[PDB]
Amino acid sequence: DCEMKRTTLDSPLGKLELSGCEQGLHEIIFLGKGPEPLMQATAWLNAYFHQPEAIEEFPVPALHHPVFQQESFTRQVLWKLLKVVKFGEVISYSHLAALAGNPAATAAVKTALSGNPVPILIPCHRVVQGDLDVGGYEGGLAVKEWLLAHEGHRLGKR
Numbered sequence: 001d002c003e004m005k006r007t008t009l010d011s012p013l014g015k016l017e018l019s020g021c022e023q024g025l026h027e028i029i030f031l032g033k034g035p036e037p038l039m040q041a042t043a044w045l046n047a048y049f050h051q052p053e054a055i056e057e058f059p060v061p062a063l064h065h066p067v068f069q070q071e072s073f074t075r076q077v078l079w080k081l082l083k084v085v086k087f088g089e090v091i092s093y094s095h096l097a098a099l100a101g102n103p104a105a106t107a108a109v110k111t112a113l114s115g116n117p118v119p120i121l122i123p124c125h126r127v128v129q130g131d132l133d134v135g136g137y138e139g140g141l142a143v144k145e146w147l148l149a150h151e152g153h154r155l156g157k158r
């Protein structure tokens, strides 16, 4: 029950609506086909597409989607995925479940990821099925393959 502003921006994947309150960025939507949090979001995202050399030098906006408010399994998944899976790497679902404190919760990791409010920022596209299988993507498989090809990964396809 937040009150939020909305920014927009051009991307190699279409136009990207950013939504967020004062306490933090809520969502990042893709359509395609001001305040500090969203100011840092728009900056980071262009750092990602156009100057990825030093993506790690742009700061990560605070996040205030409800999923991050109280503790959950979904929150530990998303928070750990953001902290450890860097640009250029990937992680299997099964191994992300282990990283989030339950090596047998792969199905729950799959579901935790489907409700990610801020793609790329939280790198849900770096979570693959296996060494040779990139898996699905809730943004569309070609997006995932694009993003991984953008990061130079062997499972990318542009």
Ligand SMILES: *Cc1ccc(CNC(=O)c2ccc(C(=O)O)c(-c3c4ccc(=[N+](C)C)cc-4oc4cc(N(C)C)ccc34)c2)cc1
Residues within 6 Å of the ligand: 113, 114, 115, 116, 119, 124, 125, 137, 138, 139, 140
């Ligand atoms: C990590 C991550 C999460 C979310 C996105 C962006 N995707 C969406 O926001 C999103 C919104 C709504 C739908 C929807 O169907 O209403 C989807 C979506 C699917 C979401 C989850 C899913 N599984 C968990 C199996 C499957 C989805 O399939 C979709 C299919 C279509 N079409 C066939 C048109 C459209 C939307 C789908 C996604 C990005 C990254």
Ligand SMILES: [Zn+2]
Residues within 6 Å of the ligand: 002, 003, 020, 021, 022, 023, 024, 026, 064, 065
């Ligand atoms: Zn909020």
